[model samples]
Target: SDVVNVVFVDRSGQRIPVSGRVGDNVLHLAQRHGVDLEGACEASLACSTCHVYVSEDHLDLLPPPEEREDDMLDMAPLLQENSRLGCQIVLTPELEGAEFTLPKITR
Candidate 1:
């Protein structure tokens, strides 16, 4: 089990840093750490409620989003070049110390 430390920043600018093992889902890790991030579709990739902003330092650490995720992100309230669906992200060793910023509620 590879453990990576990641930070989750809430909409109000609160920071909730946590350790997530490799292969962990970004959305599920937030729930475990009480970060208040959402996944209205439960990883179904059906919506954009799980949108998150990955830091520039770690953007290259993540793979490019698939078409479905890109389409879903189009619906994200505050989309950016760093925007990504939490449900589509899987923790990788390269993401250690990565920061994720959550936008305001999308639903």
Candidate 2:
């Protein structure tokens, strides 16, 4: 198993570290660990309820989002330059120490 460590930070500044395997969807992995991430569209790219802020240091390590993802993210509240829909993120070795910060609210 290709184990990758990912951290999820909630609105209250709580950090949840989860062990994920390569190719695991960030949204699904967070949900499994009760990380309070919502995937309203179930990874269908129809919504941005799973919006998250990717750690600044690792921002460049991820592939740029597709146009559809960009569209959905534009609708998310408290948007930031590093914002991304959690469902669109897949676990990779380079993301071992990546931290995803959840916004206080979602639309």
- On lDDT, the leading prediction is 2
Q: Estimate the overall C-alpha local distance difference test score of candidate 1.
A: 0.88
lDDT per residue, candidate 2, 28-94, as tens digits? 9998998889899899989999999999999999988999999998888899999998998999999
The residue pairs found clashing in candidate 1 are: none
TM-score of candidate 2 against the unseen true structure? 0.96
Per-residue accuracy of model 1 over 1-107 as CA lDDT, tens digit each: 58889999999999888978999999999999888887888999798988999999999878888899988988778678998888888899899989999987684
Regions of model 1 farther than 4 Å from truth: none
Worst lDDT window (10 residues) for model 1? Answer: 70-79
The total number of steric clashes, by the backbone 3 Å criterion, in model 1 comes to 0
Q: Rate the local accuracy (lDDT) of all candidates.
A: 0.88, 0.92
